[PDB]
Amino acid sequence: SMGESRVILAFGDALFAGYGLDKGESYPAKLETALRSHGINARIINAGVSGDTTAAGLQRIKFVLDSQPDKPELAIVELGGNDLLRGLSPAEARQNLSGILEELQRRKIPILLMGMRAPPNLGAKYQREFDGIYPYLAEKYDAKLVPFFLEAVADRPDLIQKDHVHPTARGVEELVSATSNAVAKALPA
């Protein structure tokens, strides 16, 4: 092909940063290769930061855009998972993401929003509220939405890293049954 690469900003959290993966295995790195098959030579700016909340993304979006030598031609926004993991207000996550999209829209940078979904642990009220923020934002900011970014791995535990292992309430009971003897023995009589 002739010409310089198309510049895409991948603005996100651990899922963009490539947490737990080797060089070149991250989603942005593999997406850059895959777009060659669409006839596109892209340079994808990896602005993934592991553990970023929507508030942390809002805090840095201007800095990240002002740091670019070449203005992004598309910004892919993937945040809210860490808000979920901290049980933070869905309303505040919506407000934070709105601030990020407003800054992109001010600069006339097209937006692709990666939809996040809440697991059942947070309960149905929280899950419905959180899940609804992404279509709301996509409509409000005229953004393209991928409704469920992690849909392709949702039923594929073989495609998910083993990392954090937080027991359920029943799992805690299991651990107590296994370890109470050792605790009772360790405590002086």
Q: What is the rounded distance in angstroms from the CA atom of residue 1 to the CA atom of residue 39? A: 9
48 and 17 Cβ atoms separated by less than 8 Å:
yes
Closest CA to 9 of 116, 107, 92, 99: 107
In the chain, what are the helix, strand and coil shares in percent, each to the nearest 5? 50, 15, 35
Crossing angle, helix 54-66 and helix 90-106, to 10 degrees?
10
The rounded Cα 170 to chain-centroid distance in angstroms is 29
Way the structure was solved:
X-ray
Give the three-state DSSP class for 9.
strand
Resolution in A: 1.8
Helix (H) or strand (E) holding 47: strand 42-48
What residue has token string 């990896």?
Answer: 46
Q: What is the rounded distance in angstroms from the CA atom of residue 47 to the CA atom of residue 114? A: 14
CA distances from 32 to 45, 152, 159, 165 (A): 10, 19, 20, 32
